[PDB]
Amino acid sequence: SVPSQKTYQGSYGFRLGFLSVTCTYSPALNKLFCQLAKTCPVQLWVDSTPPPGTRVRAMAIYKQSQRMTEVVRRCPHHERCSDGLAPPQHLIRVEGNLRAEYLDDRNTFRHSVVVPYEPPEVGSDCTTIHYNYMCYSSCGMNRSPILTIITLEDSSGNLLGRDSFEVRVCACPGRDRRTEEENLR
Numbered sequence: 623s624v625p626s627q628k629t630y631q632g633s634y635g636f637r638l639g640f641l642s643v644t645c646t647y648s649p650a651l652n653k654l655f656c657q658l659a660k661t662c663p664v665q666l667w668v669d670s671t672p673p674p675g676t677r678v679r680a681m682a683i684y685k686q687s688q689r690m691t692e693v694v695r696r697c698p699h700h701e702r703c704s705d706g707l708a709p710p711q712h713l714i715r716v717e718g719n720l721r722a723e724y725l726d727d728r729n730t731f732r733h734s735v736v737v738p739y740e741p742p743e744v745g746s747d748c749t750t751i752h753y754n755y756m757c758y759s760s761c762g763m764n765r766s767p768i769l770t771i772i773t774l775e776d777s778s779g780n781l782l783g784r785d786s787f788e789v790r791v792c793a794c795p796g797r798d799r800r801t802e803e804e805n806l807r
């Protein structure tokens with residue numbers, strides 16, 4: 623099957639916000655450009671605070687319809703390049719969170735990383751999670767565009783909110799964003 627990518631703010635008004643160049647986001651393209659394994663700050667914005675026990679899941683899928691049913695995973699080379707937490711096959715790793723869970727779906731084999739939802743920190747109206755992408759789009763992905771889907775869920779896995787963004791992991795993010803944005807125009 624294919625995970626839904628439909629935007630859903632839900633009851634809590636959930637949506638994402640974003641911040642040489644290691645990571646840069648294009649609102650026009652709803653696309654994040656980042657370097658391999660570097661810190662990617664993704665902000666969680668809500669209108670009302672979800673309950674304790676709420677969880678935040680990140681999962682990658684292929685954007686192109688002809689490859690949507692495929693599981694996004696690291697190429698063989700990058701499975702060997704680690705924190706000893708993220709399974710080597712996982713594309714998305716969370717940095718700086720002691721409670722990251724790395725999961726593999728029983729039936730779909732899709733990977734995801736989950737962390738507990740935390741209310742915004744002082745000096746901020748949002749919660750920031752630091753993600754790292756462990757394989758280049760050109761590797762595996764082999765130049766195919768991927769989407770990262772972030773879902774806000776309750777403790778039993780029920781959907782509370784969903785948002786998503788395209789991602790390109792590349793050596794020169796700033797330059798590639800510029801290229802794709804200029805092309806858009």
Ligand SMILES: [Zn+2]
Pocket residue numbers: 696697698699700756757758761762
């Ligand atoms: Zn790779």
